[PDB]
């Protein structure tokens, strides 16, 4: 995350972190239930064997609230394409159930119609992760969050050098130096409604980080609510 601020104690409990063989984070995820994680399809080709860490806010030290879970089943959308990044979504089933606690809790899945008319018409959403704090820097050792304005669909289309499909949406700033970045992919985009946070997107891609005339591109969760429900049963 470029700009924004630190997630303070208990503020981002749905954040998950995918860690490689060296125990280093390479992507994010969203906790949906005791057995399921939401992530990006493109994150699956960034490591061979990986696990999931929950409850962490500072990767420099183990304070005691962190827990690691192995992945039982990887459910990747069969329509994902590296060429356009369309259908950038995956669901992970864990071997053991997550223990909800301070800094560990699921985000709410909304219903499709209501989410589109009421959540996605709000002024902003919240993106979070352990990714880079600048386009060329190293990954953040602290979990960060950032408020990002929803961006008009037409304006986003005009600004992009790659096709913006109906399975995607745009959020962030034209020129202001705040955006998601490398390592944040797969993580949560949530929208607050009366002190309750609902998952509205998955961190997907951007032409670099926080560039002028450029926005952040997120997988549109509402397009995949039935698919998610089906993945959480089978």
């Amino acid at each position: 995350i470029v700009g924004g601020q630190e997630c303070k104690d208990g503020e981002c409990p749905w954040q998950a972190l995918l860690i490689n063989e060296e125990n280093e984070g390479f992507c994010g995820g969203t906790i949906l239930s005791e057995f399921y994680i939401l992530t990006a399809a493109h994150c699956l080709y960034q490591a061979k064997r990986f696990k999931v860490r929950v409850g962490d806010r500072n990767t420099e030290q183990e304070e005691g609230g962190e827990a690691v879970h192995e992945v039982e089943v990887v459910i990747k959308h069969n329509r994902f394409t590296k060429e356009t990044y369309d259908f950038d979504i995956a669901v992970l089933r864990l071997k053991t159930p997550i223990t909800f606690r301070m800094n560990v809790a699921p985000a709410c899945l909304p219903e499709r119609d209501w989410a589109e008319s009421t959540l996605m018409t709000q002024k902003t959403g919240i993106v979070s992760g352990f990714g880079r704090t600048h386009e060329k820097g190293r990954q953040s050792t602290r979990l960060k969050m950032l408020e990002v304005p929803y961006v008009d669909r037409n304006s986003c289309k005009l600004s992009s050098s790659f096709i913006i499909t109906q399975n995607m949406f745009c959020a962030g700033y034209d020129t202001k130096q705040e955006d998601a970045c490398q390592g944040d992919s797969g993580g949560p985009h949530v929208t607050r409604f009366k002190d309750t946070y609902f998952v509205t997107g998955i961190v997907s891609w951007g032409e670099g980080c926080a560039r002028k005339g450029k926005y952040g591109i997120y997988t549109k969760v509402t397009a995949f609510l039935k698919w998610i429900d089906r993945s959480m049963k089978t």
Binding site: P13, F100, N103, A107, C108, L109, T118, K194, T196
Partner: protein, 53 residues
């Protein structure tokens, strides 16, 4: 603005218009209160809430 378009129909969470009337509902892990509008967490760590303990 009428029904679900006027302040979310007074609902805490989901709002639906059924036969020209407001109907509220809640996410999994909440139950609708007796007033038919508020959403009550059924147990510990309900979805979408920042943790306090």
């Amino acid at each position: 603005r009428k029904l679900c378009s006027l302040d979310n129909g007074d609902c805490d969470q989901f709002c639906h218009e059924e036969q020209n009337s407001v109907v509220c509902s809640c996410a999994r892990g909440y139950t609708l209160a007796d007033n038919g509008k508020a959403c009550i967490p059924t147990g510990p760590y309900p979805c979408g809430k920042q943790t306090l303990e």
